[PDB]
Amino acid sequence: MDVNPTLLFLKVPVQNAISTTFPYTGDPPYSHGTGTGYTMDTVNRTHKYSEKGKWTTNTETGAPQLNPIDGPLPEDNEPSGYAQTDCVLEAMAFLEESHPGIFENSCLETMEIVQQTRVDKLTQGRQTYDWTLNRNQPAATALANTIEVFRSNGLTANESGRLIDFLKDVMDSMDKEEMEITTKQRLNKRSYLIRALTLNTIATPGMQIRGFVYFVEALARSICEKLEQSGLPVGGNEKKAKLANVVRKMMTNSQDTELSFTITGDNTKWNENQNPRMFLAMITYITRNQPEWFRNVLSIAPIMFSNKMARLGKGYMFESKSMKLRTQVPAEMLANIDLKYFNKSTREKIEKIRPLLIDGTASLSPGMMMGMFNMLSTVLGVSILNLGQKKYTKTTYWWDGLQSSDDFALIVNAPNHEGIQAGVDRFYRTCKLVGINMSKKKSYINRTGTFEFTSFFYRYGFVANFSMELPSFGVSGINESADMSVGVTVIKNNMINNDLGPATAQMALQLFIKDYRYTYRCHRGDTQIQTRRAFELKKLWEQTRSKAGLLVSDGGPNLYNIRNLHIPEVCLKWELMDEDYQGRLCNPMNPFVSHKEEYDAVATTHSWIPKREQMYQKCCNLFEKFFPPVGISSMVEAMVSRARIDARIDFESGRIKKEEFAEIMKICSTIEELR
């Protein structure tokens, strides 16, 4: 008998055991696909979908820039960047009609935000391009570097605190012809501007551009918040509802005759198509009848993205067979380089992009880099779902559904089959007019009752229950006291938010405790396992009357289960503790705590702090010149002692003269007089 797990689906429906079709559950050990060759394919394909549009030369950048929008309608089904301003605004107009006040009100709440928001906020985030040192770096370090330049150049408004003032400096920085940083390093206005508008490897953006992207997504949030169809930014179980709602809406009205089909949606090349200029058109229509200052700050992000440049990482690696060499050609001089070094597939990719290549960066006016305007792009998506109401269709077919960035789910109703087919086409084509290209490959359609949306698999009213990304249920590496609280908190939170099943949480708890005890050598007192702590913990175990009192870090039993996980361990076991044990555990005269004034922990002896240069390496390398020594002796008097021994052994065997022996003994007494 040959085992084939997939044969389960002969008995179990696929939605029930969909859990078995996710191979990893966790980030795998490769995530390959971010080469220099991969960046140039994004740059090419971004232009290839948008290639009939108007080419302009940028005055400030001096960069070839494609503008596909208000361009020629597609006559094929290939992805089109050719959006239509009149269509977008109309979609956004009919949204504000269908949700009266949505924009005005959402602007009022965002005008509250933009002022109150602090520069502090900008330090939170992933890798960022640091234009100060022309490298990728941590977010907080990239800002410290950027304010250090803005401090050196007359741009001290950032040091007021609020973010809007840091932007005011970023604005004034563009107008300045010189840009100087004491690292003195000098950038002309053109070279500065390239780096201010750079995306570096898909690719992270500069610190200048990031500021504005927040306030836009902030506005895009307040909108999404007010829309039922938007699947962002709502929580775990809160979202499963939205799936139930949209079916229940389209299936209770539906009489005997009226058909209903759900299409499991996924949009193709989402980022490479829809153009920054279109987002500017959206923002300006939302912020009509609003103050100029608010209109402006929000307008800045799309503008920068329409003028942006994509750096091609580092470059390509070469290799000589016979000679046994290898060399790394950078991106900067990949334009001014010979093509006969490269292969057949790589040449064409460089020959296509070279027209766009300006100062070692490729101009990219159309499209975007992944997950940047997630929320705003969702508004646009919803505005097309919005146009499926009986009124806007003006036909016997109508539609509704759910959208979150590129993923969507669409329910089309009509009195007959041809009606459904029509309603689908009308959605598919209305989508093309705003740069949204449904993926024919990825997508499918079936009678309403089953579908997928954001990997929630709906089947006749039930969505399958499994966590799709489990976190490291191991130790957190703070100390005994904290890690327990964190680890137990991490599981509870993964049950309520991430839809983690109980039996799995119990085993998750077991594997944590196992790791916890191994890490901190704090195996239960009654067990026989040997560590350094085994003795101390057993002496405490024997001493202690009520052992259920003892914390896991004191060789106590694990009392946690589903119900407890919210309680801190110290509280949980508080009644069961011996008077003297508790007396010591919490005595804040103890030498381990320091202070005693998102995890909840009582301060005990377990709340301890573990241990935390070119001057350390210099001393260690010189020690190797002496020993290619006694344990208690210091470095200098085990170096000065080895010198006099080699001095008097090389004097006997006759290696150094009387002159070179007297010189060593003289210097060996100058080192001893500094000690």
């Binding site: 005269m589 030498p591 573990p610």
Partner: protein, 125 residues
Amino acid sequence: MERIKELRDLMSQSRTREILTKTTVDHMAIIKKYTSGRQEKNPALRMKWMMAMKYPITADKRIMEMIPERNEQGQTLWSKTNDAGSDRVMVSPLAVTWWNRNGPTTSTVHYPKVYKTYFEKVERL
């Protein structure tokens, strides 16, 4: 000739001077160990890495007056080692357990009322 002339150069810089006269040959391996776990950058390992060491935990120097140097089995509980900022010393997790079985007992009647915010989660269950 060149290596002993170089040692006189490093003892003229008063920062490199105070790493040569303080540090011992035994306590070079202990300085190098925990920097091999900072390359790991994953804190879960960095902890497992440190718990392997004899004395990973830091404490006030008053511990040396409070708990003994060795326990009944003759295990060393702390060491007179150099810590970064001040006159804190290095301590084995044995010492924490030792304290929790032989330490001084203060009266913990105020702890249900100091941590009331925490303790109230138990009352509902």
